[PDB]
Amino acid sequence: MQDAFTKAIVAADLRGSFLSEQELNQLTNLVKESNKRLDAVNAITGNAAEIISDAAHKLFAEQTDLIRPGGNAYPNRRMAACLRDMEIILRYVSYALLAGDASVLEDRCLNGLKETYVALGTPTRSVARAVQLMKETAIGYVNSPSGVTRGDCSALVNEAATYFDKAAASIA
């Protein structure tokens, strides 16, 4: 598994080199913003259930097809599987966000996922949408939390978004 430092190290090694002063300071900045990062990961963990629930309510509000017999979130067994997958993806997105690298998300979650769903008959476009809704709400929480020091988290909100967007793209 990689994190943002480990990634630097692998690229350096492929040159046969000690880390460039370029790469060093990029990583010094990561350490600089790490308290914000911890709050951002904490924002997701602290509202995981609601993020999934709210995404869910809204997914089925939009797409009643899945809720009706013949639909991929019917009966209870399938809805529980769908709720479970929403959690799994939100979980690996939070891991990527602590790590500063998408690899755990791509390697443990996204790799093969689309082909799984197609084999199952699970409508990937609906799954992509459920991921887009989790993103909206998750970022909502990253941006408006309990008594965190005021500052600018937009860099981290972007990065979190790209992890949500990776997952969506990979699946649709």
Partner: protein, 274 residues
């Protein structure tokens, strides 16, 4: 479990199997709901001959579906050697043919157009060959004649689906794999409304065909080399299409004429509408 080494331990014939599993065989040890890894949706495992009957029975019970069984040792010898066909030898028919110049062409058109199946002597299109010899028709003209023949209709069309026919058609007539899902669809709709014959014409009067083969050149392989407006994944399709020098199109297979290019694979190169 994936791609294997070796065959046997005490001695066996290893077969590698492939399935699609429920969370009944493999699940994570997590707090909720049983799920298998998404990327092991179809999983494959190599089992020596005795454990094999027991494994298949188990898999089928706990819900999986066997997709394939194939001996391991078949599957260890790689992918085809393509040296003969990366860059082929072109054969072209000149204006005043020499009597055996024309002999060269016929043997090659046969091999290439019919996809290396044997055409027995009772079988050959003799009247049509008469025509090429006298110059009444040209090499492309003759190539069209073989395609509309029963022998071509019979080994490649009548017994397989349209998806397969078109995929063979690209290989034979154009020498390259089929690039898009649209190509398959565009063709199937033509056959449906203008018939078999109109559809056959559509590869032989195409701009792509005309550039490369012109009119006096026997269609030759050209998909193992980069081409224009070819998606990138059409170079892996060519391996699926051609199985080596001793491989052939063959409708005599035990399982019948079937595909070779996964439908899922085609979609990776793009999906639109129409």
């Amino acid at each position: 479990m994936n791609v294997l080494t070796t065959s046997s331990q005490r001695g066996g014939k290893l077969f590698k199997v492939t399935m699609t599993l429920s969370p009944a065989l493999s699940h994570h040890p997590w707090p909720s709901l049983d799920t298998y890894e998404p990327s092991q949706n179809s999983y494959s495992v190599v089992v020596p001959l005795d454990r094999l009957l027991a494994e298949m029975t188990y898999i089928k019970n706990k819900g999986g579906r066997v997709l394939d069984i194939s001996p391991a040792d078949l599957e260890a010898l790689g992918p085809p050697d393509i040296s003969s066909v990366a860059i082929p030898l072109k054969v072209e028919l000149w204006a005043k043919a020499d009597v055996s110049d024309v002999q060269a062409a016929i043997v090659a058109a046969y091999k290439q157009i019919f996809g290396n199946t044997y055409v027995l002597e009772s079988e050959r299109l003799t009247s049509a060959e008469s025509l090429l010899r006298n110059g009444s028709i040209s090499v492309r003209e003759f190539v069209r004649l073989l395609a509309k023949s029963e022998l071509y209709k019979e080994r490649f069309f009548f017994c397989t689906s349209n998806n397969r026919f078109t995929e063979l058609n690209f290989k034979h007539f154009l020498g390259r794999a089929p690039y898009n899902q649209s190509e398959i669809a565009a063709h199937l709709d033509r056959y449906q409304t203008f018939g078999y014959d109109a559809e056959i014409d559509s590869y032989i009067d195409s701009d792509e065909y005309i550039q490369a083969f012109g009119e006096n050149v026997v269609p030759y392989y050209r998909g193992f080399k980069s081409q224009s407006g070819q998606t990138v994944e059409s170079f892996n399709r060519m391996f699926k299409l051609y199985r080596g020098d001793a491989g052939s199109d063959t409708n005599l297979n035990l399982q019948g004429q079937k595909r070779r290019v996964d439908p899922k694979n085609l979609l990776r190169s793009g999906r639109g509408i129409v």
